Amino acid sequence: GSKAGLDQEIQEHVKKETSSEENTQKVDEHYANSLQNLAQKSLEELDKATTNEQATQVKNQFLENAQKLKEIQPLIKETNVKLYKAMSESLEQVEKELKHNSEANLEDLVAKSKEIVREYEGKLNQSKNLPELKQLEEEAHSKLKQVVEDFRKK
Known part of the structure; x- marks a missing residue:
């Protein structure tokens, strides 16, 4: 050493x-x-x-x-030498920018999905009967599908 x-x-x-x-x-x-x-x-x-x-x-x-x-x-x-250095540095800059942007978009979508889940879990925890449970469950799944579809088409 x-x-x-x-x-x-x-x-x-x-x-x-x-x-x-x-x-x-x-x-x-x-x-x-x-x-x-x-x-x-x-x-x-x-x-x-x-x-x-x-x-x-x-x-x-x-x-x-x-x-x-x-x-x-x-x-x-x-x-x-200078051309290769410029290429590599531009590539690294663009790579970090793309990583940051994609992570931000994914975090926003995950936050929205967890919020839909939390809203409908709070509604479901207060359910009094089975028809209300089924209605809330179906609305929740439809909202989740709408969110993920809108994101895929953003």
């Missing part, structure tokens, strides 16, 4: 490095794929050039665009 925190800290340093290098590999692979696509498009433009100057310009523009592409890779990773 006394050494658990230190073990966790050492393992966490190692995990930080391994996660850093794995994210580096992912960024490198995406960058290499984008660079291959850029190069293929520039090579197609070059094959269709009609002038040595147009061809040299295709090459120079490829080099410029390759520099631009390399410059944005860490920003690409940071943008993906």
Whole structure:
């Protein structure tokens, strides 16, 4: 127990490095794929050039665009991170809102149903004969059905 925190800290340093290098590999692979696509498009433009100057310009523009592409890779990773965080936080907010609202609706319906039951139990406890009992029981069940139906159709 006394050494658990230190073990966790050492393992966490190692995990930080391994996660850093794995994210580096992912960024490198995406960058290499984008660079291959850029190069293929520039090579197609070059094959269709009609002038040595147009061809040299295709090459120079490829080099410029390759520099631009390399410059944005860490920003690409940071943008993906921020997008995922925003999605997760919005999902959690909406989840807690839905939980609260559904619980409130259920509590209101349960309160109304228990109130119908209490009213008619109070009436039934004062019953003097069997016909009154049957009439009150039927009215109570009809009121309960009306309440639960109105809620299902709310």
